[PDB]
Structure formats: C-alpha cells, structure tokens
Design an enzyme around this catalytic site. Structure first.
Site, PDB file in Angstrom:
ATOM      1  N   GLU A  11       6.729 -73.784  -8.001  1.00  0.00           N
ATOM      2  CA  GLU A  11       7.545 -75.671  -7.830  1.00  0.00           C
ATOM      3  C   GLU A  11       8.208 -76.707  -8.374  1.00  0.00           C
ATOM      4  O   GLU A  11       8.726 -77.262  -9.092  1.00  0.00           O
ATOM      5  CB  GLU A  11       7.688 -75.847  -6.212  1.00  0.00           C
ATOM      6  N   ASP A  20      18.708 -79.319  -9.131  1.00  0.00           N
ATOM      7  CA  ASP A  20      19.694 -78.408  -9.821  1.00  0.00           C
ATOM      8  C   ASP A  20      21.073 -78.248  -9.840  1.00  0.00           C
ATOM      9  O   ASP A  20      21.706 -78.796  -9.037  1.00  0.00           O
ATOM     10  CB  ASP A  20      18.510 -77.007 -10.068  1.00  0.00           C
ATOM     11  N   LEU A  32      12.114 -80.574  -0.685  1.00  0.00           N
ATOM     12  CA  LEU A  32      13.412 -80.285   0.604  1.00  0.00           C
ATOM     13  C   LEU A  32      14.069 -81.843   0.306  1.00  0.00           C
ATOM     14  O   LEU A  32      13.067 -81.782   1.080  1.00  0.00           O
ATOM     15  CB  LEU A  32      14.061 -79.528   0.886  1.00  0.00           C
ATOM     16  N   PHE A 104       7.056 -71.750   2.103  1.00  0.00           N
ATOM     17  CA  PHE A 104       7.069 -72.993   2.325  1.00  0.00           C
ATOM     18  C   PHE A 104       8.878 -73.443   1.586  1.00  0.00           C
ATOM     19  O   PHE A 104       9.290 -73.852   1.577  1.00  0.00           O
ATOM     20  CB  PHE A 104       6.559 -73.140   1.116  1.00  0.00           C
ATOM     21  N   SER A 117      10.211 -55.885   6.670  1.00  0.00           N
ATOM     22  CA  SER A 117       9.356 -55.683   5.711  1.00  0.00           C
ATOM     23  C   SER A 117       8.255 -56.783   6.313  1.00  0.00           C
ATOM     24  O   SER A 117       7.597 -56.773   5.183  1.00  0.00           O
ATOM     25  CB  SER A 117      10.393 -57.239   4.596  1.00  0.00           C
ATOM     26  N   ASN A 132      11.717 -53.332   0.588  1.00  0.00           N
ATOM     27  CA  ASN A 132      13.377 -53.818   1.094  1.00  0.00           C
ATOM     28  C   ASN A 132      13.140 -55.488   1.046  1.00  0.00           C
ATOM     29  O   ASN A 132      14.093 -55.763   1.219  1.00  0.00           O
ATOM     30  CB  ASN A 132      12.355 -53.494   2.273  1.00  0.00           C
TER      31      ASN A 132
END
EC number: 3.2.1.17
Length: 177
Positions: A11, A20, A32, A104, A117, A132
């Site tokens: 991060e 970004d 976020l 996360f 998966s 996968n």
C-alpha cells in the site's frame, strides 16, 4: 515479514490525500476514503476518521492508527465469515497473510466470492489456486500487487517481498553495494 509490513510495502504510506491517475481518494496506508470524485467528500470521510479537521493531511501516527483499524477489520471479517474462516484456519502463517492482504484490498464480501480458488487454498492446491486467481479482475486491475500475493500463495514464503523490504529500509545505496 508480517502482514503489517507486507501491506505496508504493498500500500505504501502517504500522509496527504491522494488518488492515483485511475484511483479513488486514498490516504495513509491504502486507506480508501470514498469512491466519490469530490475532494471535499474525501476530506469529510477523513476528518470523520481522524476526529479533527485534517484539510487532507494526517500525521504518521494517524496513518498508523488507521492502518491498524483497517487490518483489524480485515482480520475480523475473515474470522466471522464462514467461507473465509475454514480457509484461514487451514493456511500457514505466510499464506494467511496473503488472504488478509486480499481482504484488506477488496473486502471480505468480495474475497468470499472466490468460491473455487478458496476451496483450492483449503485443499492446499497452491498452483491450482494461483492459476485460478490469475484470471480475476483483481489480478487484471492490480497485476503487480496480485502477482505478489498470488506468488505468496503458491510458495508460502516471502520471496515476492524480498528486495522490496530491503529496498524500503536501507535500500538503494546498499542495494547496489
């Protein structure tokens, strides 16, 4: 190479709100703020998170706190989720980290959505699981990040984070000698 340090690398740390070129308003360690375009809305979320009027800027400590809360929410989500739990339980400490990282990143709901998966991971079908997960949007949209996580799944080591940690701390000066 704990999760904390793993996500730390992944991060990165930013004290000032940012987004970004093709990202959302974020701050600190991949925190976020909102999917909204207005700087204001992001700031609002922030202040709401910090407990003060930030003007889009926080301290290192503030970042820290947020990071912990974020990691705690991730872990928590995994533990209380019937789909992630069983898997989490079966994983080694390294891989568990891999899963916490996904959680996360995309949330427990999203991660829990990886039915096949997830099973593979629970069966220790590392390669199969890597193959996968490789065809996901996640991998598609964050190839680099996903590549590192996936790589941690198939090997169960920190190899993918190898020169990064070194680089980040006492890096590029010593990295070359």
């Amino acid at each position: 190479m704990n999760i904390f340090e793993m996500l730390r690398i992944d991060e990165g740390l930013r004290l000032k709100i940012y987004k970004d070129t093709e990202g959302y308003y974020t701050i600190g360690i991949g925190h976020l703020l909102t999917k909204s375009p207005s700087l204001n809305a992001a700031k609002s979320e922030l202040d709401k998170a910090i407990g003060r009027n930030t003007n889009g800027v926080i301290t290192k400590d503030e970042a820290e706190k947020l990071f912990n809360q974020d990691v705690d929410a991730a872990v928590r989500g995994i533990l209380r989720n019937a789909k992630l739990k069983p898997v989490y339980d079966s994983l080694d400490a390294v891989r568990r980290a891999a899963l916490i990282n996904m959680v996360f990143q995309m949330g427990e709901t999203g991660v829990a959505g990886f039915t096949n998966s997830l099973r593979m991971l629970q069966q220790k079908r590392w390669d199969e699981a890597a193959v996968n997960l490789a065809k996901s949007r996640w991998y598609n949209q964050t190839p680099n990040r996903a590549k590192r996580v996936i790589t941690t799944f198939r090997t169960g080591t920190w190899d993918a984070y190898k020169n990064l940690e070194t680089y980040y701390t006492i890096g590029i000066g010593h990295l070359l000698t």
